Short mmCIF file of C-alpha atoms in Angstrom, two decimals:
data_model
loop_
_atom_site.label_atom_id
_atom_site.label_comp_id
_atom_site.label_asym_id
_atom_site.label_seq_id
_atom_site.Cartn_x
_atom_site.Cartn_y
_atom_site.Cartn_z
CA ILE A 1 -12.29 267.81 203.54
CA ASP A 2 -8.67 268.49 202.53
CA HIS A 3 -7.26 265.25 203.93
CA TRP A 4 -4.21 263.56 202.42
CA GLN A 5 -2.08 260.44 202.79
CA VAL A 6 1.65 260.30 201.99
CA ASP A 7 3.83 257.28 201.23
CA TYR A 8 7.28 256.45 199.91
CA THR A 9 7.08 254.27 196.79
CA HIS A 10 9.68 252.22 194.92
CA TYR A 11 9.86 251.94 191.12
CA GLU A 12 12.84 250.01 189.75
CA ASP A 13 15.86 251.88 191.18
CA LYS A 14 13.94 255.09 191.96
CA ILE A 15 12.17 256.50 195.02
CA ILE A 16 8.91 258.41 194.57
CA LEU A 17 7.09 260.35 197.29
CA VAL A 18 3.36 259.95 196.61
CA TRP A 19 0.59 262.14 198.04
CA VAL A 20 -3.08 261.23 197.54
CA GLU A 21 -6.09 263.35 198.55
CA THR A 22 -8.68 260.98 200.01
CA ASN A 23 -11.78 262.93 198.92
CA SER A 24 -11.12 263.64 195.23
CA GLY A 25 -8.40 261.14 194.32
CA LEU A 26 -6.04 263.96 193.37
CA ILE A 27 -2.42 262.81 193.17
CA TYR A 28 0.94 264.53 193.63
CA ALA A 29 4.26 262.75 193.16
CA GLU A 30 7.94 263.60 192.89
CA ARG A 31 11.20 261.67 192.69
CA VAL A 32 13.47 261.97 195.73
CA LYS A 33 17.03 260.91 196.50
CA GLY A 34 16.29 259.21 199.83
CA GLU A 35 14.00 258.94 202.85
CA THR A 36 15.67 261.45 205.17
CA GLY A 37 13.60 263.90 207.19
CA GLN A 38 15.35 266.95 205.74
CA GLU A 39 14.40 266.19 202.14
CA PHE A 40 10.90 265.28 203.32
CA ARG A 41 10.55 268.74 204.85
CA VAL A 42 11.63 270.26 201.53
CA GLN A 43 8.96 268.26 199.70
CA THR A 44 6.49 269.22 202.44
CA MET A 45 6.92 272.91 201.59
CA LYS A 46 6.35 272.36 197.86
CA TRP A 47 3.27 270.27 198.63
CA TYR A 48 1.71 272.88 200.91
CA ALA A 49 2.38 275.70 198.45
CA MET A 50 0.32 273.93 195.79
CA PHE A 51 -2.72 272.64 197.65
CA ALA A 52 -3.11 274.38 201.05
CA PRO A 53 -3.96 271.16 202.93
CA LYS A 54 -5.41 270.73 206.42
CA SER A 55 -4.77 267.17 207.62
CA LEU A 56 -2.44 264.29 206.82
CA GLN A 57 -2.01 260.60 207.60
CA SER A 58 1.14 258.49 207.26
CA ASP A 59 2.84 255.54 208.88
CA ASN A 60 5.42 256.05 211.63
CA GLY A 61 8.45 256.19 209.34
CA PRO A 62 11.46 258.13 210.64
CA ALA A 63 11.09 261.13 208.30
CA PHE A 64 7.46 261.44 209.45
CA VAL A 65 8.00 261.22 213.24
CA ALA A 66 11.11 263.42 213.52
CA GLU A 67 10.68 266.38 215.86
CA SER A 68 11.43 268.96 213.16
CA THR A 69 8.74 267.43 210.94
CA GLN A 70 6.14 267.64 213.72
CA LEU A 71 7.02 271.29 214.39
CA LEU A 72 6.85 272.08 210.67
CA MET A 73 3.39 270.51 210.37
CA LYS A 74 2.20 272.59 213.33
CA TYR A 75 3.84 275.68 211.83
CA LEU A 76 1.81 275.30 208.62
CA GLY A 77 -1.44 274.52 210.45
CA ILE A 78 -1.53 270.84 209.46
CA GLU A 79 -2.99 268.16 211.74
CA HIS A 80 -0.59 265.27 211.07
CA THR A 81 -1.54 261.85 212.47
CA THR A 82 1.17 259.22 212.30
CA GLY A 83 -0.17 255.70 211.94
CA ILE A 84 -2.78 254.87 209.30
CA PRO A 85 -6.33 254.59 210.72
CA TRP A 86 -9.02 252.06 209.81
CA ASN A 87 -11.15 253.46 206.98
CA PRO A 88 -12.40 251.26 204.11
CA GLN A 89 -13.32 254.13 201.78
CA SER A 90 -9.91 255.82 201.83
CA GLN A 91 -7.83 252.63 202.07
CA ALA A 92 -9.48 251.23 198.94
CA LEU A 93 -9.00 254.47 197.00
CA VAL A 94 -5.31 254.71 197.96
CA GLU A 95 -4.67 251.13 196.84
CA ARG A 96 -6.30 251.59 193.42
CA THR A 97 -4.50 254.91 192.97
CA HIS A 98 -1.06 253.42 193.68
CA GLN A 99 -1.61 250.54 191.25
CA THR A 100 -2.82 252.80 188.43
CA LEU A 101 0.21 255.07 188.87
CA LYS A 102 2.70 252.23 188.37
CA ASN A 103 0.80 250.91 185.34
CA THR A 104 0.61 254.36 183.72
CA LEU A 105 4.27 255.15 184.42
CA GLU A 106 5.21 251.91 182.63
CA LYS A 107 3.66 253.14 179.38
CA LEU A 108 4.84 256.76 179.45
CA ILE A 109 8.52 256.15 180.26
CA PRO A 110 9.54 255.17 176.68
CA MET A 111 7.86 258.30 175.25
CA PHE A 112 10.01 260.84 177.10
CA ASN A 113 13.73 261.45 177.56
CA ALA A 114 13.46 262.19 181.29
CA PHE A 115 11.85 260.18 184.07
CA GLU A 116 10.53 263.48 185.44
CA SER A 117 8.59 264.09 182.22
CA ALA A 118 7.05 260.61 182.28
CA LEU A 119 6.00 261.15 185.89
CA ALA A 120 4.53 264.56 185.04
CA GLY A 121 2.68 263.13 182.05
CA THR A 122 1.34 260.43 184.36
CA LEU A 123 -0.09 263.07 186.71
CA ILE A 124 -1.77 264.73 183.72
CA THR A 125 -3.41 261.46 182.66
CA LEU A 126 -4.78 260.64 186.10
CA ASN A 127 -5.70 264.10 187.42
CA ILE A 128 -6.89 265.89 184.26
CA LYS A 129 -7.79 263.45 181.49
CA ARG A 130 -9.85 260.66 183.05
CA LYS A 131 -13.48 261.53 183.82
CA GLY A 132 -15.71 259.87 186.40
CA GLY A 133 -19.36 258.91 186.24
CA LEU A 134 -20.47 262.56 186.32
CA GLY A 135 -17.86 263.54 183.73
CA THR A 136 -15.66 265.36 186.26
CA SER A 137 -11.96 264.66 186.73
CA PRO A 138 -10.20 264.42 190.11
CA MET A 139 -8.88 267.96 189.63
CA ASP A 140 -12.39 269.21 188.83
CA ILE A 141 -13.54 267.73 192.15
CA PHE A 142 -10.60 269.12 194.13
CA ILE A 143 -11.22 272.65 192.83
CA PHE A 144 -14.98 272.42 193.36
CA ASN A 145 -14.31 271.44 196.98
CA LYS A 146 -12.04 274.47 197.43
CA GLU A 147 -14.61 276.95 196.10
CA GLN A 148 -17.27 275.48 198.39
CA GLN A 149 -15.18 276.20 201.48
CA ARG A 150 -14.59 279.82 200.44
CA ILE A 151 -18.30 280.53 199.90
CA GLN A 152 -18.84 279.11 203.40
CA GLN A 153 -16.84 281.67 205.39
CA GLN A 154 -17.55 284.48 202.92
CA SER A 155 -21.31 284.08 203.35
CA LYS A 156 -21.00 283.79 207.14
CA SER A 157 -19.40 287.25 207.12
CA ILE A 158 -16.65 300.67 203.77
CA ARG A 159 -14.17 300.53 200.89
CA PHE A 160 -12.90 303.07 198.37
CA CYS A 161 -10.98 302.51 195.16
CA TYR A 162 -9.80 303.71 191.79
CA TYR A 163 -11.45 302.18 188.74
CA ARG A 164 -11.26 302.20 184.95
CA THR A 165 -13.48 301.16 182.06
CA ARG A 166 -12.73 299.31 178.82
CA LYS A 167 -13.90 300.37 175.36
CA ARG A 168 -13.32 297.75 172.63
CA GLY A 169 -11.01 295.79 174.95
CA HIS A 170 -8.62 298.58 175.95
CA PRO A 171 -8.45 300.02 179.49
CA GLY A 172 -8.96 303.71 180.09
CA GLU A 173 -7.64 306.36 182.44
CA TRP A 174 -7.81 305.68 186.17
CA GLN A 175 -10.78 307.41 187.80
CA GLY A 176 -11.84 308.12 191.36
CA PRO A 177 -11.62 307.83 194.21
CA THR A 178 -15.16 306.55 194.80
CA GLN A 179 -17.02 304.32 197.23
CA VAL A 180 -17.26 300.58 196.61
CA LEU A 181 -21.04 300.15 196.71
CA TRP A 182 -20.90 296.34 196.59
CA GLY A 183 -18.05 293.85 196.43
CA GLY A 184 -18.92 290.80 194.35
CA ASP A 185 -17.16 287.73 192.97
CA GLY A 186 -14.71 289.30 190.54
CA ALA A 187 -16.68 292.54 190.21
CA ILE A 188 -17.64 295.67 192.13
CA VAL A 189 -20.37 298.28 191.69
CA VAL A 190 -19.66 302.03 191.86
CA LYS A 191 -21.63 305.16 191.01
CA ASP A 192 -20.06 307.51 188.48
CA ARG A 193 -20.16 311.13 189.63
CA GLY A 194 -19.67 312.33 186.06
CA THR A 195 -22.54 310.57 184.28
CA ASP A 196 -24.63 309.79 187.40
CA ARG A 197 -25.19 306.16 186.45
CA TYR A 198 -24.27 302.92 188.18
CA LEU A 199 -21.37 300.87 186.83
CA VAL A 200 -19.86 297.40 187.23
CA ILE A 201 -16.06 297.03 187.21
CA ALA A 202 -13.97 293.86 187.16
CA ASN A 203 -11.27 293.12 189.74
CA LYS A 204 -8.39 293.77 187.34
CA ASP A 205 -9.73 297.29 186.66
CA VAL A 206 -9.91 298.20 190.38
CA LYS A 207 -7.21 299.55 192.70
CA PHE A 208 -8.49 299.41 196.28
CA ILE A 209 -7.48 302.04 198.84
CA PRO A 210 -6.20 300.48 202.08
CA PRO A 211 -8.04 301.00 205.38
CA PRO A 212 -6.26 303.25 207.99
CA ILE B 1 -8.78 283.56 181.06
CA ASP B 2 -5.96 281.09 181.82
CA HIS B 3 -3.19 283.17 180.26
CA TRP B 4 0.39 283.01 181.52
CA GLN B 5 3.79 284.59 180.94
CA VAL B 6 7.10 282.78 181.46
CA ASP B 7 10.58 284.23 182.01
CA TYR B 8 14.04 283.14 183.07
CA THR B 9 15.22 285.05 186.14
CA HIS B 10 18.63 285.42 187.79
CA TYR B 11 19.20 285.50 191.55
CA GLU B 12 22.84 285.59 192.67
CA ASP B 13 24.35 282.46 191.06
CA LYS B 14 21.00 280.71 190.48
CA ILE B 15 18.55 280.48 187.59
CA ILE B 16 14.80 280.51 188.31
CA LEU B 17 12.06 279.85 185.76
CA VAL B 18 9.13 282.10 186.70
CA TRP B 19 5.54 281.67 185.51
CA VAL B 20 2.90 284.33 186.25
CA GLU B 21 -0.83 284.09 185.50
CA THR B 22 -1.92 287.48 184.19
CA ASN B 23 -5.50 287.39 185.53
CA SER B 24 -5.04 286.36 189.18
CA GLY B 25 -1.37 287.09 189.84
CA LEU B 26 -0.73 283.43 190.69
CA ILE B 27 2.97 282.54 190.60
CA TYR B 28 4.92 279.35 189.93
CA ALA B 29 8.70 279.16 190.13
CA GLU B 30 11.43 276.53 190.16
CA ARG B 31 15.22 276.50 190.08
CA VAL B 32 16.79 275.14 186.89
CA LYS B 33 20.31 274.22 185.85
CA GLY B 34 20.33 276.13 182.56
CA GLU B 35 18.29 277.60 179.70
CA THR B 36 18.26 274.64 177.32
CA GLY B 37 15.09 273.64 175.50
CA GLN B 38 15.12 270.10 176.88
CA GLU B 39 14.95 271.17 180.52
CA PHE B 40 12.35 273.78 179.58
CA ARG B 41 10.15 271.02 178.14
CA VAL B 42 10.53 269.09 181.40
CA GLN B 43 9.42 272.15 183.38
CA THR B 44 6.61 272.65 180.85
CA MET B 45 5.14 269.25 181.74
CA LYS B 46 5.20 269.94 185.48
CA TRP B 47 3.59 273.34 184.90
CA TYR B 48 0.75 271.95 182.78
CA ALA B 49 0.05 269.13 185.25
CA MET B 50 -0.60 271.66 188.01
CA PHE B 51 -2.67 274.37 186.35
CA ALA B 52 -4.15 273.15 183.02
CA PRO B 53 -3.35 276.38 181.14
CA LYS B 54 -4.61 277.56 177.76
CA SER B 55 -2.32 280.31 176.44
CA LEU B 56 1.21 281.56 177.02
CA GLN B 57 3.43 284.52 176.13
CA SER B 58 7.22 284.69 176.21
CA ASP B 59 10.08 286.38 174.42
CA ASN B 60 11.82 284.67 171.50
CA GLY B 61 14.51 282.94 173.57
CA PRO B 62 15.98 279.76 172.10
CA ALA B 63 14.29 277.33 174.51
CA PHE B 64 10.95 278.96 173.63
CA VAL B 65 11.25 278.94 169.81
CA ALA B 66 12.76 275.46 169.35
CA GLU B 67 10.70 273.19 167.11
CA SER B 68 10.20 270.54 169.80
CA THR B 69 8.85 273.20 172.18
CA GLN B 70 6.32 274.41 169.59
CA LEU B 71 5.15 270.85 168.93
CA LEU B 72 4.86 270.18 172.67
CA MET B 73 2.74 273.30 173.18
CA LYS B 74 0.43 272.19 170.36
CA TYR B 75 0.35 268.66 171.80
CA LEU B 76 -0.96 269.98 175.13
CA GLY B 77 -3.47 272.36 173.53
CA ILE B 78 -1.57 275.54 174.45
CA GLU B 79 -1.60 278.63 172.23
CA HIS B 80 1.99 279.85 172.67
CA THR B 81 2.84 283.30 171.27
CA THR B 82 6.52 284.16 171.19
CA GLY B 83 7.21 287.86 171.58
CA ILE B 84 5.60 289.86 174.38
CA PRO B 85 2.61 291.96 173.22
CA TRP B 86 1.68 295.49 174.26
CA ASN B 87 -0.66 295.33 177.26
CA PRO B 88 -0.39 297.80 180.17
CA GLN B 89 -2.49 295.77 182.62
CA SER B 90 -0.44 292.57 182.36
CA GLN B 91 2.96 294.23 181.91
CA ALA B 92 2.49 296.23 185.11
CA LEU B 93 1.37 293.16 187.08
CA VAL B 94 4.33 291.08 185.87
CA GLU B 95 6.80 293.80 186.87
CA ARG B 96 5.41 294.17 190.40
CA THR B 97 5.28 290.39 190.79
CA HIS B 98 8.93 289.90 189.81
CA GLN B 99 10.12 292.61 192.21
CA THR B 100 8.12 291.24 195.16
CA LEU B 101 9.51 287.74 194.55
CA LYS B 102 13.13 288.88 194.81
CA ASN B 103 12.41 290.93 197.94
CA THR B 104 10.58 288.05 199.64
CA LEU B 105 13.25 285.50 198.70
CA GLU B 106 15.85 287.75 200.35
CA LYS B 107 14.13 287.43 203.73
CA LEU B 108 13.26 283.72 203.65
CA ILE B 109 16.67 282.37 202.56
CA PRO B 110 18.30 282.61 206.04
CA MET B 111 15.34 280.77 207.65
CA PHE B 112 15.75 277.52 205.70
CA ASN B 113 18.57 275.09 204.99
CA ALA B 114 17.70 274.66 201.30
CA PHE B 115 17.16 277.27 198.60
CA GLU B 116 14.23 275.15 197.40
CA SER B 117 12.49 275.57 200.76
CA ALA B 118 12.96 279.35 200.74
CA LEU B 119 11.53 279.49 197.22
CA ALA B 120 8.58 277.31 198.25
CA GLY B 121 7.95 279.43 201.33
CA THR B 122 8.03 282.48 199.07
CA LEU B 123 5.28 280.99 196.88
CA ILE B 124 3.20 280.38 200.02
CA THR B 125 3.57 284.01 201.13
CA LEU B 126 2.57 285.49 197.77
CA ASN B 127 -0.09 283.02 196.60
CA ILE B 128 -1.80 282.04 199.86
CA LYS B 129 -1.11 284.54 202.64
CA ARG B 130 -1.55 288.03 201.18
CA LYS B 131 -5.16 289.16 200.68
CA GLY B 132 -6.39 291.78 198.24
CA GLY B 133 -9.00 294.48 198.64
CA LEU B 134 -11.83 291.93 198.71
CA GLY B 135 -9.93 289.69 201.13
CA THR B 136 -9.16 287.05 198.48
CA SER B 137 -5.68 285.75 197.74
CA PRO B 138 -4.29 285.12 194.23
CA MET B 139 -4.96 281.40 194.69
CA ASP B 140 -8.54 282.12 195.77
CA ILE B 141 -8.99 284.04 192.51
CA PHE B 142 -7.34 281.37 190.35
CA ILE B 143 -9.59 278.65 191.77
CA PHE B 144 -12.73 280.79 191.49
CA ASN B 145 -11.91 281.36 187.82
CA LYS B 146 -11.56 277.60 187.27
CA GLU B 147 -14.94 276.77 188.83
CA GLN B 148 -16.62 279.45 186.71
CA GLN B 149 -15.43 277.81 183.48
CA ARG B 150 -16.71 274.39 184.55
CA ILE B 151 -20.20 275.68 185.37
CA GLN B 152 -20.19 277.24 181.89
CA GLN B 153 -19.93 274.06 179.81
CA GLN B 154 -21.81 271.97 182.39
CA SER B 155 -24.86 274.25 182.22
CA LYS B 156 -24.71 274.42 178.41
CA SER B 157 -25.12 270.63 178.38
CA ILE B 158 -29.45 257.65 181.80
CA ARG B 159 -27.05 256.44 184.49
CA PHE B 160 -27.10 253.56 186.96
CA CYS B 161 -24.93 252.99 190.02
CA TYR B 162 -24.31 251.28 193.31
CA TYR B 163 -24.71 253.38 196.45
CA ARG B 164 -24.28 253.19 200.21
CA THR B 165 -25.44 255.17 203.23
CA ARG B 166 -23.62 256.30 206.37
CA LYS B 167 -24.92 255.93 209.93
CA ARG B 168 -22.88 257.82 212.55
CA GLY B 169 -20.07 258.35 210.04
CA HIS B 170 -19.53 254.75 208.92
CA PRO B 171 -20.38 253.51 205.41
CA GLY B 172 -22.76 250.61 204.93
CA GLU B 173 -23.16 247.71 202.54
CA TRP B 174 -23.22 248.45 198.82
CA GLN B 175 -26.76 248.54 197.44
CA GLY B 176 -28.29 248.54 193.98
CA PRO B 177 -28.16 248.74 191.11
CA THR B 178 -30.57 251.67 190.75
CA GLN B 179 -31.18 254.58 188.41
CA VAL B 180 -29.41 257.90 188.98
CA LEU B 181 -32.43 260.21 189.14
CA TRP B 182 -30.33 263.40 189.17
CA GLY B 183 -26.60 264.07 189.08
CA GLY B 184 -25.63 267.09 191.15
CA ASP B 185 -22.45 268.78 192.34
CA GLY B 186 -20.99 266.13 194.62
CA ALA B 187 -24.32 264.36 195.16
CA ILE B 188 -26.89 262.21 193.37
CA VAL B 189 -30.53 261.37 194.06
CA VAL B 190 -31.87 257.81 193.91
CA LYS B 191 -35.10 256.12 194.96
CA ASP B 192 -34.80 253.24 197.43
CA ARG B 193 -36.82 250.21 196.35
CA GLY B 194 -36.77 248.86 199.91
CA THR B 195 -38.19 251.81 201.85
CA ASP B 196 -39.80 253.62 198.87
CA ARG B 197 -38.34 257.00 199.79
CA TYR B 198 -36.00 259.33 197.93
CA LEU B 199 -32.37 259.57 199.03
CA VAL B 200 -29.33 261.77 198.45
CA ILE B 201 -25.89 260.14 198.20
CA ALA B 202 -22.46 261.78 198.03
CA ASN B 203 -19.97 261.07 195.25
CA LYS B 204 -17.66 258.98 197.45
CA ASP B 205 -20.58 256.65 198.29
CA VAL B 206 -21.46 256.03 194.62
CA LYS B 207 -20.02 253.53 192.14
CA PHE B 208 -21.30 254.37 188.66
CA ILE B 209 -21.97 251.65 186.09
CA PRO B 210 -20.30 252.40 182.73
CA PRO B 211 -22.38 252.96 179.58
CA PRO B 212 -22.21 250.17 176.90
#
């Protein structure tokens, strides 16, 4: 679904916190100063802001089992299970992913001035550049999985707005208010009182009016 | 499309590099030590790794016009235009976005120990939590825009593999090789030689065999 595993990793004299998403192989990594629970909670916020995860697995390291970490996971709606379970599919993918990261970091370090740049370039190579058997990257798969979840709840489920049209690429005067006849994916349909014809407007040319 | 604007921002005695995507309102921010071109190129790598952008607008600040920055933008395939153009839709969205960030950061600072956590919590609030007129967040819109571009080139466009089935949630022995009859979105179709029936396998239960 949106399940992740987190580990502390060592590279020469540096400590790297490594997150791996067990469905798409997406990777997220960042250099840290130590293994304290406070810095792990800082990294936890940056991780959630980027990916909106749902569940997490880790070993029972101190930063992971601290009471403040457990309360933070619950506060963000994350089901965090300490102790790695038995799963051949995810365990094999995590192992390959960790090995490829170290090998790629070895090549990209001499290209850049900063270790942070080499690590960022490594994420680019693994998440964006390499394509699987179907020609999709890990980030292509992660995004596709996100959009599938949104269609799920949206399909299982009166507005008014201002709108404007564009002639030769330039937006016009705001018009309305008028009823939103149909809300679509990035577009709405309204009926123009002036010309008495139906129109389609994009989201960036619509200002919705808030319910009561 | 995937167009962004970048600015340096001041908050008390801190410097924040702020990126805003002009189609979805998505925001990315990070505290920096100064305004040098070297640190800006470091931040540029982290930004590209996360969002895979295409175009960028900024003013003609020194970190933005340096020769190494221009070559880096070209190296990553980014059309970078120094000097902000005239565009009412994007200029109004950037202004609102910057004001909301400062107001939200003011509230979340006393909740956290670290300024980095308050900034990360601010990104959560703006990108994930708040919903527009159609009930979609800025991150919902950003992702939806990504998946639309992938369907575009994929629709405008012989494989073999190993595969395995799952009974009660557990994966079975690897089987094959066999021809990929149809590659779908997260699934393939193969014909089982043993039972002589068609099957559907998910991507994580497929090991593709590389072309020559």
